[PDB]
Amino acid sequence: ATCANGKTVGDASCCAWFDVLDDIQANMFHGGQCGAEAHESIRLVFHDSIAISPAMEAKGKFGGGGADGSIMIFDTIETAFHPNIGLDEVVAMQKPFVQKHGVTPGDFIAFAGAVALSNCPGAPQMNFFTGRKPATQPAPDGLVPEPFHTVDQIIARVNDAGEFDELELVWMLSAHSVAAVNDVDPTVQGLPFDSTPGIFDSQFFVETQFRGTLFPGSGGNQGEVESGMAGEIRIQTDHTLARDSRTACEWQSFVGNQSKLVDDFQFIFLALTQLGQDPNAMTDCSDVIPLSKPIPGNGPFSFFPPGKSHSDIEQACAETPFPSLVTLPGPATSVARIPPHKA
């Protein structure tokens, strides 16, 4: 199908998403940047999608419908759930685009998380399928993990939601590579999970492995533990998945291994996007998503930030020694904050 703009797609229904694409690249991602709104849109996919529970269906029935746009349709209800803190603003921003283009909330959330990732260097080539009907009921609370849940709790939650195993839990957490936290530390917003929040790379996995030495802002916040780097926040679930015997070697496997990071996250992100859906009833519009850019310099893919070395690593994978990475030159730095979006 040749769209009105001359670009070819498989299904002509996909042609409409080019207009959506142009509208959000300009009016929501500020010219296709991998910054706050891109990060917020990647996060939204997870909070929409994971709220599904076959377990619950079998007992206290409606476990939620997954990737159905419910968090936007019933936003007053769902974004008030404490694990969904801060998403009322993200939904408020996305909602006008859904309303004017007449696309379903589910497909837009899926579209905007794929586009947001195509804006981050190093991102996999992202997929996009359309076909999610609007939710008719809000997800129950209790389905989105908290940063203070136990490793056993998260493994069980993810397993229930879509039969993901604990290796796949580590893969989807790759998204904290292009991410900041606005709401855990009440004194500062935009503290990144890693030193490169606009780059999809394995620095999240290198840096959560350092011994925790400092709080970036205040201490005593529920769900936060020390990081080993100034300006960087570390949440407790990420801290302990890095060290736990079930996930420690998978955590570490990403260090210095870009192709594994990318191929695993391409896969797992599409799977989140299809929770509660039948893939065989969806239309592939991956042709609309723009090509992801390479990570631009000529550096090592993974490294130790200035002032860190192998001595700072808390070796948790017993089978494989932590790789020998270069330490970048210079004294220790402070990772800069990404201010959250206006409104």
Ligand code: HEM
């Ligand atoms: C065990 C599950 C997870 C936990 C406990 C967790 C927890 C968190 C927390 C506490 C924040 C900050 C929220 C705030 O301050 O408002 C955060 C941010 C984020 N998370 Fe997760 N997360 C998990 C899984 C995921 C997954 C699987 C993805 C999606 C593919 C994801 C993507 C993000 C992104 C991109 C952000 C940054 C949002 C922004 O910059 O505005 N998270 N996560």
Ligand SMILES: *[C@@H]1O[C@H](CO)[C@@H](O)[C@H](O)[C@H]1NC(C)=O
């Ligand atoms: C990256 O991971 C893949 C999949 O486990 C593995 O086959 C490959 O050898 C790893 N690459 C490096 C550079 O170790």
Ligand SMILES: [Ca+2]
């Ligand atoms: Ca949902």
Ligand SMILES: [Ca+2]
């Ligand atoms: Ca990163």
